[PDB]
Design a protein around this ligand. Structure first.
Ligand SMILES: *[C@@H]1O[C@H](CO)[C@@H](O)[C@H](O)[C@H]1NC(C)=O
Lengths: 175, 42, 65
């Protein structure tokens, strides 16, 4: 509804993280969406563990550093009954053995909602829910050396997506 | 152009605008931004 | 189906974190390949092998044969 939204201003977003050379972006997108929902629910912003998801969500369908899906990650947290914090379960950028410790579990999900494939519906969810997990086509050189401005790539695909990221808001430029 | 989605990337703060990127909004689903969107229920 | 085409055909449309190659109209690997999840592109030989010291976040000038 509003013309502009930026959840960073309301304390829903943790600092920018770095996945390194591991295809775990699906895990960063998932902890990103869960950090915002947990904050909205408790009023406390706590960085969640991507490594906990990389190491333990194989039964939900994830493949560690070789790919995965945000929904499988949300499914894992629900099936597992918890997700450890970043501090207690640091990111190593590699798949290791599952070392989930319930004692350090600071998050919990109940399921997930899939948004209809339309930008108009996405805007509504971003304005009312909080940061939203999304997948984009980031496999272009232009995306690599992006610095400022609005990114637009004529060769971008709406059907093939290779990178999970997090939508923290939207807006428009001055007039 | 004018409208954008504020997106948080995971390649560290050195990339883009402090780790963020303004993606074209309302350009008919540019880069598939609305093709696989979801959130968890808590 | 070419080597490049068979590889593409094994990865789904929505694949965050998986590398999927790009092929041209003839089924060849495009000289420049990008792994969107990690943010790196590089040049490849016609057989899909990476060209040494070509992985970067900068501009590329990959060739074919
Ligand atoms: C690919 O082609 C290059 C150039 O001839 C060659 O050096 C390399 O060994 C080849 N790799 C394979 C797996 O055939």
């Amino acid at each position: 509804a509003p013309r502009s939204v930026d959840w960073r201003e309301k304390g829903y977003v943790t600092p920018v993280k770095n996945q390194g050379q591991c295809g775990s972006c699906w895990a960063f997108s998932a902890t990103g969406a869960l950090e915002g929902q947990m904050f909205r629910k408790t009023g406390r912003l706590i960085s969640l563990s991507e490594q906990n998801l990389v190491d333990c969500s194989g039964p939900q369908g994830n493949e560690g550093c070789n790919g995965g899906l945000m929904d499988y990650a949300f499914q894992y947290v629900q099936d597992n009954g918890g997700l450890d914090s970043e501090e207690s379960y640091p990111y190593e950028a590699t798949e290791e053995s599952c070392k989930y410790n319930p004692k350090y579990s600071v998050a919990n999900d109940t399921g997930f909602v899939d948004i209809p494939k339309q930008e108009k519906a996405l805007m509504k969810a971003v304005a009312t829910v909080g940061p939203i997990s999304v997948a984009i086509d980031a496999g272009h050189e232009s995306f690599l050396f992006y610095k400022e401005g609005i990114y637009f790539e004529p060769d971008c695909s709406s059907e093939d997506m290779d990178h999970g990221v997090l939508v923290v808001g939207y807006g428009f430029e001055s007039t | 152009n004018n409208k954008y989605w504020l997106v948080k990337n995971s390649w560290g703060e050195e990339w883009g605008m402090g780790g963020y990127v303004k993606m074209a909004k309302d350009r008919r689903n540019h880069c598939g931004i609305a093709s696989a969107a979801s959130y968890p229920t808590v | 189906l070419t080597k490049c085409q068979e590889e593409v055909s094994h990865i789904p449309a929505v694949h965050p974190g998986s590398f999927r190659p790009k092929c041209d109209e003839n089924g060849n690997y495009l000289p420049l390949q990008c792994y969107g999840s990690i943010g790196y592109c590089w040049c490849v030989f016609p057989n899909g092998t990476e060209v040494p010291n070509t992985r970067s976040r900068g501009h590329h000038n990959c060739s074919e044969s």
